[PDB]
Amino acid sequence: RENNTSFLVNVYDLKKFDTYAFNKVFIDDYKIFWINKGSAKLVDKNCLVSYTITASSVVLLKKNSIQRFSLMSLSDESISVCVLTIKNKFVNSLRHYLQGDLMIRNLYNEKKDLLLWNCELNDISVLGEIVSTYDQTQYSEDFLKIFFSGFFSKVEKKYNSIFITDDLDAMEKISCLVKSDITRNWRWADICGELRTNRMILKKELESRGVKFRELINSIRISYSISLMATGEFKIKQIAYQSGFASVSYFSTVFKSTMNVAPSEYLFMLT
Q1: What distance separates the 2 farthest-apart alpha carbons in the chain?
Q2: CATH topology for the 212-271 domain
Q3: How far is Cα 131 from Cα 177, in angstroms, rounded to an integer?
Q4: Which among 167, 194, 203 is positioned nearest to 88, based on CA atoms?
Q5: Are 69 and 50 in contact (CB under 8 A)?
Q6: How far apart are the C-alpha atoms of 214 and 222, rounded to whole Å?
Q7: 270 Cβ partners below 8 Å, 6+ apart?
Q8: Which end of the chain is more exposed for a tag (fewer CB within 10 A), N or C?
Q9: What is the C-alpha to C-alpha distance for residues 31 and 62, in angstroms, rounded to an integer?
Q10: Quick check: 152 and 91 in contact, CB under 8 A?
Q11: Shared fold status for 165-211 and 212-271
């Protein structure tokens, strides 16, 4: 299949009673995921908290976040996890179109990296309906453009929290810097220099997510390698080398230490 634009649709088969563990996976863009049928359990490993998501539940993973969570099937049916990615072009468009200004903002919900909402059952119907049609030339892109223009506007003023921030974030600068030269052997001095800062906002943004400097770079390269596997055709050796890993062994180790699957197994989950 071809690529996409402002919205990335990726559906995965949830093997009944299989655990989907994620250890420090980098979330490059905003992502929401929900199950089409059945039920499942969501376990966040950072905060010792569990959840029971249903077909009416939706989960948000914020951009530039380091996630440590797990998802486990609780249904006899091969559940169909739909993961939708929201790129920056819709983020800047959504942030402007909303002319509202919150008088009291729940800063706890703004600092959290894994939100959970139970949508109106009417919205779940519109959810899987438009997703099953994607995509058309700037035609299906506008169908989800209008849906999330009202869904996010509703949930933001309902919870009195900004869930999709605009730009200007220290993690966005580090991420786009490393991705501008993914194969470069980035060190600490290269990040501080081209960002015109020192280890005050730097180490804190690493300690706030519980990752070393090397751990962050590896997780950025994992998600970059995943975006290459999304095309459909690519040998693991090229994916490892074009993502910045010196050897296929260290790429497979970090990938399995991040996705809890072999890199070839994720290629089978796609096709």
Answers
A1: 54
A2: Arc Repressor Mutant, subunit A (1.10.10)
A3: 32
A4: 167
A5: no
A6: 13
A7: 10, 229, 230, 232
A8: C
A9: 7
A10: no
A11: yes
Q: Which of the 8 DSSP states describes residue 261?
A: S
Tell me the H-state helices in the chain.
Answer: 88-97, 107-111, 121-131, 140-159, 170-179, 188-195, 201-207, 213-229, 236-242, 248-259, 263-270
Q: What is the DSSP string of 174-201?
A: HHHHHHTTTTS---HHHHHHHHT--TTH
Phi, psi of 104 (to 5 degrees): -135, 120
* Residue ranges of domains in the chain: 1-164, 165-211, 212-271
To what resolution in angstroms was this structure determined?
Answer: 2.5
Domain 1-164 has what CATH class? mainly beta
Q: How was this structure determined?
A: X-ray
Side chain identity at 109, as an amino acid letter? N
Which CATH superfamily does the domain covering 165-211 fall into?
ToxT, HTH1 motif (1.10.10.1310)
Q: After which residues is the chain broken (C to N over 2.5 A)?
A: none
